[PDB]
Amino acid sequence: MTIRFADKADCAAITEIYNHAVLHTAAIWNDRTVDTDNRLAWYEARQLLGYPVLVSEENGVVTGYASFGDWRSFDGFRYTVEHSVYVHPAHQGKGLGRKLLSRLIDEARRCGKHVMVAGIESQNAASIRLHHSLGFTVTAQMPQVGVKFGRWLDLTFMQLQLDEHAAPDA
Amino acid sequence: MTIRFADKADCAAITEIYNHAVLHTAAIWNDRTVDTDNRLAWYEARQLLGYPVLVSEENGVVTGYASFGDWRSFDGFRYTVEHSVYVHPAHQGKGLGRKLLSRLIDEARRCGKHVMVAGIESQNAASIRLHHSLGFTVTAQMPQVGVKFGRWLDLTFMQLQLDEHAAPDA
């Protein structure tokens, strides 16, 4: 297994993993599938922001991917990012999520980001454990803020502070 | 005092109040001022979404304004809105914030929204009290996620569930 930066050529595999998350999981709270061109667009936008898109690979097959984006739109949140880590359903129970997330955190420090936030369905105990093991702490428990598959969903935020330096000048 | 829906003609007054919040408060975590055309643009966009823009008025003067927008971008959050209520600095200690917020909540029910979220600087005890008095509860305490005026800022989320009905079908 290796983890590397994604290329344009990885976007078809990313699309499959994204669409799986969308249709068959509560790991992303979006409802419709996209095409490869859409994930290329998304990929380019991330590149434009200087944000990382990582893939895990095994025997030349993309087994997972990870990225982060801005957590919120306003200026004041510009050092807080929110991650997305998705593992292909043929490839979990192999610790790829944690390895992807660890690498992502490193990239977040290179971008000077101050906090990484994870948005986790509150009932996902496995994800909560994985995040605790990387030093994340639970800072939100928000009932019924989401909706999917005919039910209201509860959201947990967890976060990890990435440095103890001062904020930028006024 | 009255509260009414805003018009295009209220956008210059809204702009003043917005810019005050931006420059002189930690009530909004944005850093630069905008012009009236920008708030007209923002106003129209809200109208396009069917979302309310309210103003408080006294003797023909706009003393405050309130609106809500989508809390997060993803489909699954489409019944969760986040409010913004700003009172003109010549007009607080008059209970306008709470009155604006109460009216806003009513408008949120008319839009079928299921949860309203407030994002509050954690040290703003007065805002926390005002929200508790309308049935909001604290569901997030997130240190150093924001930045303004040379310091890291802590964010509190509070929320109010607006109905106890079922979610939309799958």
Short mmCIF file of C-alpha atoms in Angstrom, two decimals:
data_model
loop_
_atom_site.label_atom_id
_atom_site.label_comp_id
_atom_site.label_asym_id
_atom_site.label_seq_id
_atom_site.Cartn_x
_atom_site.Cartn_y
_atom_site.Cartn_z
CA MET A 1 0.00 0.00 0.00
CA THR A 2 1.12 3.57 -0.74
CA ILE A 3 -0.47 7.01 -0.42
CA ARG A 4 0.32 9.68 -2.99
CA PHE A 5 -1.07 12.90 -4.40
CA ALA A 6 -3.91 12.29 -6.85
CA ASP A 7 -3.63 12.97 -10.62
CA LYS A 8 -6.29 13.82 -13.21
CA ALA A 9 -6.11 10.11 -14.16
CA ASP A 10 -7.35 9.11 -10.65
CA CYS A 11 -10.61 11.03 -11.00
CA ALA A 12 -12.61 8.15 -12.51
CA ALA A 13 -11.71 5.97 -9.48
CA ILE A 14 -12.45 8.87 -7.06
CA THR A 15 -15.86 9.30 -8.74
CA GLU A 16 -16.72 5.64 -8.08
CA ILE A 17 -15.76 5.93 -4.41
CA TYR A 18 -17.62 9.30 -4.05
CA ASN A 19 -20.80 7.88 -5.66
CA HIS A 20 -20.63 4.80 -3.44
CA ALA A 21 -20.46 7.09 -0.38
CA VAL A 22 -23.41 9.11 -1.76
CA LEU A 23 -25.72 6.18 -2.56
CA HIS A 24 -24.90 3.56 0.03
CA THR A 25 -23.61 5.29 3.15
CA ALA A 26 -24.31 8.08 5.61
CA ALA A 27 -20.61 9.06 5.37
CA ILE A 28 -21.49 11.97 3.08
CA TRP A 29 -24.76 13.87 3.36
CA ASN A 30 -25.28 14.41 -0.38
CA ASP A 31 -27.93 12.48 -2.35
CA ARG A 32 -27.10 12.37 -6.07
CA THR A 33 -24.26 10.80 -8.01
CA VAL A 34 -21.89 12.83 -10.19
CA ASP A 35 -19.85 12.03 -13.28
CA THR A 36 -16.06 11.93 -13.78
CA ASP A 37 -16.04 15.45 -15.34
CA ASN A 38 -17.59 16.75 -12.13
CA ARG A 39 -14.82 15.23 -9.98
CA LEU A 40 -12.20 16.58 -12.40
CA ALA A 41 -13.79 20.02 -11.88
CA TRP A 42 -13.72 19.48 -8.10
CA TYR A 43 -10.11 18.24 -8.29
CA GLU A 44 -8.97 21.30 -10.27
CA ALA A 45 -10.72 23.66 -7.87
CA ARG A 46 -8.80 22.01 -4.97
CA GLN A 47 -5.53 22.37 -6.89
CA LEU A 48 -6.40 26.05 -7.45
CA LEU A 49 -6.79 26.50 -3.65
CA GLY A 50 -3.50 24.65 -3.01
CA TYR A 51 -5.46 21.95 -1.12
CA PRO A 52 -4.43 18.29 -1.24
CA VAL A 53 -6.19 15.42 -2.94
CA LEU A 54 -4.58 12.13 -1.81
CA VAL A 55 -5.18 8.58 -2.97
CA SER A 56 -4.35 5.23 -1.42
CA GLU A 57 -3.12 2.67 -3.94
CA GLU A 58 -2.51 -1.11 -3.84
CA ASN A 59 -1.28 -3.10 -6.85
CA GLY A 60 -2.10 -0.08 -9.02
CA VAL A 61 -5.73 0.13 -7.80
CA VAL A 62 -7.05 3.27 -6.04
CA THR A 63 -8.44 1.93 -2.72
CA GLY A 64 -9.41 5.26 -1.13
CA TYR A 65 -9.04 9.01 -1.28
CA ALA A 66 -8.83 12.02 1.04
CA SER A 67 -9.03 15.80 0.76
CA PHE A 68 -9.92 18.86 2.78
CA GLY A 69 -11.71 22.09 2.06
CA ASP A 70 -12.71 25.23 3.89
CA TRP A 71 -15.03 24.38 6.77
CA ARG A 72 -17.09 27.58 6.46
CA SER A 73 -17.24 30.48 3.93
CA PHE A 74 -16.41 33.48 6.12
CA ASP A 75 -12.90 35.06 6.36
CA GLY A 76 -12.59 34.26 10.03
CA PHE A 77 -12.66 30.51 9.39
CA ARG A 78 -9.81 30.51 6.83
CA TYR A 79 -7.47 28.48 9.09
CA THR A 80 -10.11 25.81 9.79
CA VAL A 81 -10.54 23.00 7.27
CA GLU A 82 -12.91 20.05 7.11
CA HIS A 83 -11.65 16.69 5.80
CA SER A 84 -13.25 14.07 3.64
CA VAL A 85 -11.78 10.56 3.69
CA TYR A 86 -13.55 7.81 1.73
CA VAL A 87 -12.41 4.21 1.43
CA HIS A 88 -13.57 1.99 -1.45
CA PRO A 89 -16.01 -0.63 -0.11
CA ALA A 90 -13.77 -3.50 -1.32
CA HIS A 91 -10.96 -2.14 0.86
CA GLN A 92 -11.97 -1.38 4.42
CA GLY A 93 -10.97 -3.13 7.66
CA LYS A 94 -7.43 -2.47 6.40
CA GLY A 95 -6.74 0.75 8.33
CA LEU A 96 -6.61 2.88 5.16
CA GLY A 97 -8.89 5.59 6.54
CA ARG A 98 -6.53 6.34 9.43
CA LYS A 99 -3.43 6.28 7.20
CA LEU A 100 -5.08 8.67 4.70
CA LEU A 101 -6.20 10.96 7.51
CA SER A 102 -2.70 11.01 9.08
CA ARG A 103 -1.13 12.05 5.76
CA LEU A 104 -3.91 14.67 5.28
CA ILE A 105 -3.09 16.26 8.66
CA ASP A 106 0.53 16.69 7.56
CA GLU A 107 -0.65 18.45 4.40
CA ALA A 108 -2.91 20.68 6.51
CA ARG A 109 0.14 21.84 8.53
CA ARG A 110 2.00 22.64 5.25
CA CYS A 111 -0.95 24.89 4.34
CA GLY A 112 -0.68 26.57 7.79
CA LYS A 113 -4.14 25.36 8.81
CA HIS A 114 -4.85 25.75 12.56
CA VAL A 115 -7.75 23.30 13.16
CA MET A 116 -9.05 20.24 11.17
CA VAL A 117 -12.68 19.41 11.70
CA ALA A 118 -14.34 16.06 11.09
CA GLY A 119 -18.13 15.85 10.54
CA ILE A 120 -19.21 12.37 11.62
CA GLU A 121 -22.68 10.77 11.89
CA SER A 122 -23.07 10.55 15.67
CA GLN A 123 -23.79 6.81 15.66
CA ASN A 124 -20.50 5.97 13.81
CA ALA A 125 -18.57 4.72 16.83
CA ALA A 126 -15.77 3.29 14.63
CA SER A 127 -15.07 6.69 13.06
CA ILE A 128 -15.16 8.35 16.49
CA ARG A 129 -12.56 5.83 17.77
CA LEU A 130 -10.35 6.34 14.71
CA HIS A 131 -10.43 10.10 15.23
CA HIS A 132 -9.71 9.88 19.00
CA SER A 133 -6.65 7.76 18.10
CA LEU A 134 -5.31 10.73 16.10
CA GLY A 135 -5.87 13.21 18.90
CA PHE A 136 -9.27 14.57 17.77
CA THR A 137 -11.81 15.53 20.43
CA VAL A 138 -15.63 15.75 20.25
CA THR A 139 -16.70 19.40 20.21
CA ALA A 140 -20.26 19.15 18.78
CA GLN A 141 -23.24 16.83 19.14
CA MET A 142 -26.04 18.22 16.99
CA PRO A 143 -29.30 16.27 16.75
CA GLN A 144 -31.43 16.12 13.56
CA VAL A 145 -29.34 18.67 11.58
CA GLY A 146 -29.07 16.23 8.65
CA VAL A 147 -31.45 14.07 6.63
CA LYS A 148 -30.95 10.96 4.48
CA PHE A 149 -32.75 7.65 3.75
CA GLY A 150 -36.00 8.81 5.36
CA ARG A 151 -34.51 9.69 8.74
CA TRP A 152 -33.19 12.75 10.59
CA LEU A 153 -29.45 12.42 11.19
CA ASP A 154 -27.34 13.57 14.16
CA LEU A 155 -23.96 15.21 13.53
CA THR A 156 -20.85 14.99 15.66
CA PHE A 157 -18.01 17.41 15.07
CA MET A 158 -14.56 16.42 16.18
CA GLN A 159 -11.52 18.62 15.91
CA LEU A 160 -7.72 18.64 16.13
CA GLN A 161 -5.69 21.78 16.78
CA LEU A 162 -2.60 21.63 14.56
CA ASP A 163 -0.25 24.14 16.29
CA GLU A 164 -0.06 26.43 19.31
CA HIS A 165 1.21 29.54 17.49
CA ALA A 166 -0.30 33.01 17.62
CA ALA A 167 -3.03 34.14 15.24
CA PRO A 168 -2.17 36.49 12.34
CA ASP A 169 -1.90 40.21 13.17
CA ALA A 170 -5.21 42.11 13.73
CA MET B 1 -41.15 49.67 16.91
CA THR B 2 -42.22 47.34 14.09
CA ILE B 3 -40.62 44.44 12.23
CA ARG B 4 -41.34 43.95 8.54
CA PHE B 5 -39.91 42.30 5.46
CA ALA B 6 -37.03 44.28 3.98
CA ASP B 7 -37.24 46.09 0.60
CA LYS B 8 -34.53 47.03 -1.91
CA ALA B 9 -34.72 50.52 -0.35
CA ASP B 10 -33.54 49.11 3.04
CA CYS B 11 -30.26 47.81 1.63
CA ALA B 12 -28.25 50.99 2.28
CA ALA B 13 -29.23 50.82 5.99
CA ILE B 14 -28.51 47.04 6.10
CA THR B 15 -25.07 47.72 4.58
CA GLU B 16 -24.24 50.17 7.38
CA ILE B 17 -25.27 47.67 10.06
CA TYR B 18 -23.39 44.79 8.28
CA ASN B 19 -20.20 46.89 7.96
CA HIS B 20 -20.42 47.91 11.61
CA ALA B 21 -20.64 44.22 12.58
CA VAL B 22 -17.65 43.48 10.30
CA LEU B 23 -15.34 46.26 11.54
CA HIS B 24 -16.22 46.70 15.18
CA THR B 25 -17.56 43.42 16.52
CA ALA B 26 -16.89 39.70 16.72
CA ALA B 27 -20.58 39.10 15.86
CA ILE B 28 -19.64 38.25 12.27
CA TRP B 29 -16.36 36.56 11.36
CA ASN B 30 -15.77 38.46 8.11
CA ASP B 31 -13.10 41.18 7.82
CA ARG B 32 -13.86 43.59 4.97
CA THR B 33 -16.67 46.04 4.37
CA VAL B 34 -18.99 45.82 1.36
CA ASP B 35 -20.98 48.39 -0.61
CA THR B 36 -24.76 48.80 -1.00
CA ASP B 37 -24.73 47.02 -4.41
CA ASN B 38 -23.23 43.99 -2.68
CA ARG B 39 -26.05 43.85 -0.10
CA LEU B 40 -28.61 44.33 -2.88
CA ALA B 41 -27.02 41.30 -4.59
CA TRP B 42 -27.15 39.37 -1.29
CA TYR B 43 -30.77 40.48 -0.74
CA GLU B 44 -31.85 39.32 -4.22
CA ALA B 45 -30.13 35.97 -3.77
CA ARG B 46 -32.11 35.47 -0.52
CA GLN B 47 -35.35 36.41 -2.30
CA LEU B 48 -34.44 33.86 -5.01
CA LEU B 49 -34.12 31.15 -2.31
CA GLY B 50 -37.43 32.22 -0.72
CA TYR B 51 -35.53 33.15 2.47
CA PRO B 52 -36.58 36.09 4.64
CA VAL B 53 -34.80 39.39 5.13
CA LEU B 54 -36.46 41.27 8.03
CA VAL B 55 -35.85 44.77 9.35
CA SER B 56 -36.74 46.42 12.63
CA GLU B 57 -37.93 50.01 12.23
CA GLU B 58 -38.57 52.91 14.65
CA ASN B 59 -39.76 56.35 13.51
CA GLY B 60 -38.88 55.33 9.94
CA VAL B 61 -35.27 54.38 10.84
CA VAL B 62 -33.97 50.81 10.28
CA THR B 63 -32.64 49.80 13.74
CA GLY B 64 -31.68 46.19 12.93
CA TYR B 65 -32.03 43.35 10.47
CA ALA B 66 -32.26 39.55 10.41
CA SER B 67 -32.03 36.77 7.85
CA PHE B 68 -31.15 33.11 7.54
CA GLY B 69 -29.34 31.02 4.99
CA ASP B 70 -28.35 27.42 4.49
CA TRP B 71 -26.09 26.27 7.32
CA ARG B 72 -24.00 23.95 5.12
CA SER B 73 -23.79 23.25 1.34
CA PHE B 74 -24.64 19.55 1.18
CA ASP B 75 -28.14 18.18 0.31
CA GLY B 76 -28.52 16.52 3.68
CA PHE B 77 -28.47 19.86 5.51
CA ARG B 78 -31.27 21.46 3.45
CA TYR B 79 -33.66 21.66 6.44
CA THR B 80 -31.05 23.31 8.70
CA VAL B 81 -30.59 27.07 8.48
CA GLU B 82 -28.24 29.46 10.24
CA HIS B 83 -29.50 32.92 11.28
CA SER B 84 -27.87 36.30 11.25
CA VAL B 85 -29.36 39.03 13.45
CA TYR B 86 -27.58 42.39 13.66
CA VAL B 87 -28.74 45.40 15.64
CA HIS B 88 -27.54 48.93 14.79
CA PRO B 89 -25.14 50.13 17.51
CA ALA B 90 -27.37 53.14 18.31
CA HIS B 91 -30.21 50.73 19.12
CA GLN B 92 -29.27 47.92 21.45
CA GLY B 93 -30.33 47.28 25.06
CA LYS B 94 -33.85 47.57 23.60
CA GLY B 95 -34.56 43.85 23.09
CA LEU B 96 -34.61 44.16 19.28
CA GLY B 97 -32.34 41.16 18.71
CA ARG B 98 -34.75 38.80 20.47
CA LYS B 99 -37.81 40.25 18.70
CA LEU B 100 -36.10 39.93 15.29
CA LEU B 101 -35.02 36.37 16.08
CA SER B 102 -38.54 35.38 17.22
CA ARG B 103 -40.04 36.64 13.94
CA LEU B 104 -37.24 34.87 11.99
CA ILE B 105 -38.11 31.53 13.63
CA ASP B 106 -41.71 31.90 12.44
CA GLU B 107 -40.46 32.48 8.89
CA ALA B 108 -38.23 29.40 9.19
CA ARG B 109 -41.31 27.26 10.00
CA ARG B 110 -43.10 28.69 6.90
CA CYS B 111 -40.11 27.48 4.84
CA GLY B 112 -40.44 24.01 6.49
CA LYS B 113 -37.00 24.31 8.11
CA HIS B 114 -36.36 21.66 10.81
CA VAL B 115 -33.49 23.19 12.86
CA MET B 116 -32.17 26.81 13.23
CA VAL B 117 -28.56 27.11 14.23
CA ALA B 118 -26.90 30.10 15.86
CA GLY B 119 -23.11 30.58 15.64
CA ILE B 120 -22.07 32.63 18.66
CA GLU B 121 -18.62 33.69 19.93
CA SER B 122 -18.30 31.51 23.03
CA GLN B 123 -17.60 34.44 25.37
CA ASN B 124 -20.86 36.27 24.38
CA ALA B 125 -22.85 35.38 27.49
CA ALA B 126 -25.62 37.88 26.61
CA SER B 127 -26.28 36.21 23.25
CA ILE B 128 -26.24 32.77 24.90
CA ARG B 129 -28.88 33.97 27.42
CA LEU B 130 -31.03 35.48 24.67
CA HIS B 131 -30.93 32.22 22.74
CA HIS B 132 -31.73 30.05 25.81
CA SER B 133 -34.77 32.28 26.37
CA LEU B 134 -36.06 31.21 22.94
CA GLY B 135 -35.54 27.53 23.59
CA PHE B 136 -32.11 27.14 21.92
CA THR B 137 -29.61 24.72 23.46
CA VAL B 138 -25.79 24.63 23.25
CA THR B 139 -24.70 21.80 20.96
CA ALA B 140 -21.11 22.86 20.07
CA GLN B 141 -18.15 24.44 21.85
CA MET B 142 -15.30 24.67 19.35
CA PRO B 143 -12.05 26.32 20.43
CA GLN B 144 -9.86 28.40 18.07
CA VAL B 145 -11.90 27.65 14.90
CA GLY B 146 -12.14 31.39 14.11
CA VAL B 147 -9.74 34.32 13.92
CA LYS B 148 -10.22 38.10 14.17
CA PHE B 149 -8.43 41.13 15.69
CA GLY B 150 -5.19 39.20 16.29
CA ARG B 151 -6.74 36.42 18.36
CA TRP B 152 -8.07 32.88 17.88
CA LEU B 153 -11.82 32.79 18.48
CA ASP B 154 -13.98 30.06 20.05
CA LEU B 155 -17.34 29.18 18.47
CA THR B 156 -20.49 28.06 20.22
CA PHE B 157 -23.31 26.54 18.20
CA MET B 158 -26.78 26.65 19.62
CA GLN B 159 -29.80 25.11 17.99
CA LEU B 160 -33.60 24.99 18.08
CA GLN B 161 -35.62 22.14 16.60
CA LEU B 162 -38.67 23.65 14.90
CA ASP B 163 -41.04 20.63 14.65
CA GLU B 164 -41.27 16.96 15.58
CA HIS B 165 -42.49 15.66 12.20
CA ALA B 166 -40.96 12.86 10.17
CA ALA B 167 -38.18 13.44 7.65
CA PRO B 168 -38.97 13.41 3.90
CA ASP B 169 -39.23 9.98 2.23
CA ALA B 170 -35.92 8.12 1.55
#
